[PDB]
RNA sequence: CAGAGGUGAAAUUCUUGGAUUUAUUGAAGACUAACUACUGCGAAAGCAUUUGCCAAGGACGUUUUCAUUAAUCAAGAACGAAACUAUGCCGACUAGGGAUCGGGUGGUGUUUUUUUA
């Protein structure tokens, strides 16, 4: 019945990625960001880009076929900050308007086990 | 139906059972089920067949998270406001000197609290300071800037100095006609 | 090891096959 | 191995003996290296002189990829160039040495030299008789893997142009002088294209060739054959890959717009045969389809094909061996069972698809100790049932597969035995109840298990699942072997033996075979052929009347080992190869001298030094205990089991002679008298002689449709 | 950044011409999970193209994809775990997975770990009967009893080394007892964990043992018949 | 077999019972020795049976 | 497939030889998160993944042994970018109270288990 893909949605406090894969995780559907679809620079992050690019990855997606997605969300993670963006809320809330189902959300921010910093 | 939990203790089991009828008021009036479990001392979030916003489910986790780690509920509602983020910064890996990690989160947090108060009336954040960790709680440009001045103090620059930075760059941004000059002129 | 137990079986293979003087010079 | 320096070329074996043997390492004593060293020095012993000659043909190729060449009065050089013929060349004589030896006789001297630099490097077992003391080319079935019988009623030398579909012209005796190397390599060619990868390598004899003729001769004259030439028949061995053995369609090239060199020689290769078929991911290919039989293989098709169409009209095609083999094997009684191949499994995994249907079940009941393993061990489990699992056939005595239930740890079970078996009765009516209430497709019943001695209330839960199965489930516990163990322990000094075979009865039933299970289940997957194998040996120990003594586990043991250990010989690759090295190794096998050491793996976890010297160990004292085998005979054992009684103990002197005399009557047979219908007729009928009394019974209703035959 | 205040680098200095379209020329290959779970279809996959169908089977069987144990098996009570899945065997719009990895998910290791208890990590290198080169993590986490009136319940360090010891002997004995398929319909049920409990209860009392991450190491040569036969040959349609 | 298997076991648990309170019922000897048994034993035979292994 | 990074906004930089991203791997130099304290050890500086090897140490338990062998220390010997709002009467010292870390004794039942650990 329904096709399903996952969303790779890396929201960063700079930048929004909504990236659909496939299943296997190596064919890449479509990858569009809020910084190519916002006009002003500044604005590279906000709720309005990644709307946006929610909406171009949607169509794209309906056009191949998928219907539904595992939306896996990310931080920056590692030695920076673990907290998601503000375009990560509004590409899955965008991205559940436009219309795909909306199969498993995940959280999976690289965490270090043990980080990489002098102990001065 | 997806599904988010967390543990607590027991001082705030007496707590959360004061306070949890209205949890479940706001949750309930974002559509998503949470449930209270004090022989485990389990706080978890459920979404319900009448729930439209997964952005909501991760501010309830969010929510259950803060409110573990013994935020008020004031604090923990406005997490669950729309434009508002949590953040922990960890302390610990900084210093190998006990003494001197003792001193600077002291510092960090200043005499009868007045750098701390004043960070937090600066940023328009909400700041807890909790031995390894910091827990701050606000917009996402407030988080910004108390990660790092909360890095820089756990280095060795002087909160004093961030706040006076931040007071200048206050006022800079509040004349608006230096949309393009970089402001290191003036900073210290 | 495989050196001693080949070498004494390639010794008996050996007196086993050998052929006979009598029938050398009689050829 | 059955080589000489004789012409070869001729439809003949050999081409590669003493006088090529000593050319051949005198040029590798003068040299060998990739850039001229020398392979072999004049201090080395022939040991050392062996292995580097073998390790050289081994290694180098000298037929496809390169040519080595040498000077006879500086040095020899391999260079990477291949003559499509065996070349080792010597410019000082402007020779080359091998030309006797066809591309066949090539690739099995490679194949040879494979397997005996393998049986060098060997260092567990003693590999020197083994090697140099077998003859196996005695008999071409045991040597070839696939015989075939064809008579070619040619005619005369001017009948030649109406008896052939090749032409043999003038060209054609300038380069195949002789009518016999001309029909040689046509078949070598025609039957090598024919078969393609099914074949690892071929063989073709010439049955009927007289290399000697009196001197009022001119030549060697004769007229057997249907013809005057010097031949009785053609006799076409095959060496066989297994796995693409029964593969349906025989894949050619792919489809352009024009017509390819190669699919323009397969389709006036195949003719009629040939189509162009859409396969099911949408390839455009051609092939050609055949139809697989349990009688006879695709092997036998193609090649009847073949000679039929390009060599005569003709010539006669015969394997009646093979033939009659795949009919002995049983056939079971189901839809498309003629049809059906002999490496199907289909009902095998119906089985076990219904098996895990009840697994599921009756993993998922609520229980007071949850459910911890369930294990299949069963003959059907491991694929060498004798009869192939039929749905509702309940009256073959494997039609209860066994499995092995076993709960998690407990400290409250009861320290007595019978009243633990009792609990565990407890246990097995409590999971009746709960079927009969919530499955009641399902049907179920209670009986008895007195296999184990003294140990009398064990009870086995027997499940019908309705398509048609049934198992009898038995419950495995944590504190049986301590039971066992105490009760050996508190039993007085003449009694302790019984407990002895009491406990390892226990063993053999409850704890190894589920080992030995999973290990001969991985072990039949990478060799397909041991279960048809297992089944004829099965067959035959039936009616030679020695399996109601002998357990199957052993059956299955002294089944495997050709397949396990092969050496001198090949891998099997057919049911009647198969069968047969299993006879003539169970003839030749010295039970009073030779203990049987297995390693159950993949071909190339393997016992090594330490293990195996302490199994030989376990085994000289077991003979130091008992010399002439009044109590013992079988000392077999594998990683499973290091123990070597665990399950050929409590077998009669008189049956374990009576099986070893089988086979050496059996193999006498086949050594006086050629290999044939009669002969293995002959196998198959039963004894019923040197028996003191026999006792004719007969059941009031005939049971072969019930059995599923 | 599509406006115009943004200066001009080299960039966009000759961009090639968008007339490929890959999902016309790609193509729809379906997968099939093994017989050791029960929602056995799962999903759809994309390959670019089939004219080298070297380029075909080369990128299906190199690979790998991963599920969630719900939708694998219907069960919430699996929900928290992941599986992943090789695809060895390609035949005809139906690849062959084969079990390569299991995870849990970080949520649920944030949800056990508490403060007033004890950690126990555990892991063990180990081959199975097949010659797969495994390593298995598991994890165990202290409790008090029902009478306890201490906050906290720590193990001491000789508690923790018997209960390692324990651990490590039981895992090893399972997998090289095992064999690859029955490791699988080992860890579904989630058997192991009840066993390390029940053999560990007599030292310490633990409250969440689990097997937390299992990782394939090395695999043996490929056998398209064992898969097979692990799973559960065709003729065309004569075109002319 | 139900009848069987609840009276096997009605009477298997009185005799195990039994044994077990007369091993831990505090056997003092009549020279005024007690007799060192341990937490989870439950058969004075057995406690022979330990010396005879010994 | 055309931006990515970064900032209050920028900028330097990397990017049609595909940067950022996605997936399977491989190597390298560090580090040892959450558990992590109402703590533990070491003379101090200091010390957190597993398992061994080597030697050391405290307290406890002792109807063991030596029988004043000790304490305190000037000299000598061993070990070894920072600071930035902290500040507590002391002592040759009386009763204690809740904790907790390590050892031992007794009572007492739950959790445990039973001739094999």
Redesign the pocket.
Known sequence: SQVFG?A?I?A????T?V?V?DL?????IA?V????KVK??????SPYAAMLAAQDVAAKCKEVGITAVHV?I?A?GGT?TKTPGPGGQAALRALARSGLRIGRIED?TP?????????? | ESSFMTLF?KYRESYLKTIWNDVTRALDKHNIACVLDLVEGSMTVKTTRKTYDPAIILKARDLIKLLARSVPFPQAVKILQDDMACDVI?I??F??????FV??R??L????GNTLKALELLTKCYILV????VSAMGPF?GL??VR?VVEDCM????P?YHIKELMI?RE??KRPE???????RFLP | FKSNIFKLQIDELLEQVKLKQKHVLKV | RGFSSNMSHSGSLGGFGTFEFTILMAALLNGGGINSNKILLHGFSSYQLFKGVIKYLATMDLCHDGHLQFHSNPASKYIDEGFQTPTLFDKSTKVNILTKMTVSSYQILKEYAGETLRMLNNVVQDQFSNIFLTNISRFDNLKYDLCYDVQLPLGKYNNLETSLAATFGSMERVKFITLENFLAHKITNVARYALGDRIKYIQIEMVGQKSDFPITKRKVYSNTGGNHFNFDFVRVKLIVNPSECDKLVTKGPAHSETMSTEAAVFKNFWGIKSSLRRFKDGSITHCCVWSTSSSEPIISSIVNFALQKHVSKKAQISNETIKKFHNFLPLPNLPSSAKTSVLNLSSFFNLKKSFDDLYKIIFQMKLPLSVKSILPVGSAFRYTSLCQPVPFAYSDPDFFQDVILEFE???????EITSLEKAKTAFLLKIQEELSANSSTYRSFFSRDESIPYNLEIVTLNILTPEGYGFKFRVLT??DE??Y??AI??ARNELKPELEATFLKFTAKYLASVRHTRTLENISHSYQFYSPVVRLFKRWLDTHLLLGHITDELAELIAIKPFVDPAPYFIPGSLENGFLKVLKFISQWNWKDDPLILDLVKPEERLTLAQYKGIQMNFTNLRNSDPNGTHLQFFVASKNDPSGILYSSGIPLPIATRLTALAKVAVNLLQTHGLNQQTINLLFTPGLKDYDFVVDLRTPIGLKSSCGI | ??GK???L????????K?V???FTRKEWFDIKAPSTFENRNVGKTLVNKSTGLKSASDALK???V?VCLADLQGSEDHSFRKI?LRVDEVQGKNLLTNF??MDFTTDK??SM???????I??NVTVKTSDDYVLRIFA?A?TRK???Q????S?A?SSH??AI??VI?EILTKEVQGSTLAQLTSKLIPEVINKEIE??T??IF?LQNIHVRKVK??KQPKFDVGALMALHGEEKGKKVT | LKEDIHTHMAIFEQREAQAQEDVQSSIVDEDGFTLVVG?????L???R??I???
Do not use: C
Request: hydrophobic letters at 25%; charged letters at 40%; glycine letters at 6%.
């Open positions: 996952v790779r890396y960063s406090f700079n930048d990625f990236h894969t296997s995780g190596k064919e890449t990858r960001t809020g910084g190519m002003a620079d500044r604005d590279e992050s896996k990310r920056t920076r999976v965490v270090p086990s043990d980080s990489t910093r002098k102990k001065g | 203790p960890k610990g890996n210093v190998t000197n006990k003494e001197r001193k600077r002291q510092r947090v200043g005499p009868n909790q031995g390894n960790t440009k910004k800037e790092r280095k060795n620059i002087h004093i760059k800079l941004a230096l949309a393009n000059e970089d402001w290191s | 740890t407990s400290p409250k079970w009861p320290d944590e504190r301590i039971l163990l105490r322990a508190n | 950044a599509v205040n943004k200066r680098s080299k960039g966009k200095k000759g961009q090639k968008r490929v379209d890959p190199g690979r790998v991963e992943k390569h990895g290791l944030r770990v508490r403060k007033w208890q004890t950690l990590e555990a994890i986490f009893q029902a009478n009136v201490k906050r906290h720590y001491q923790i080394r390692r010891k490590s029940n053999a209860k007599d009392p394939l190491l | 937490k989870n034993t439950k058969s035979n057995s406690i049976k330990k005879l292994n010994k």
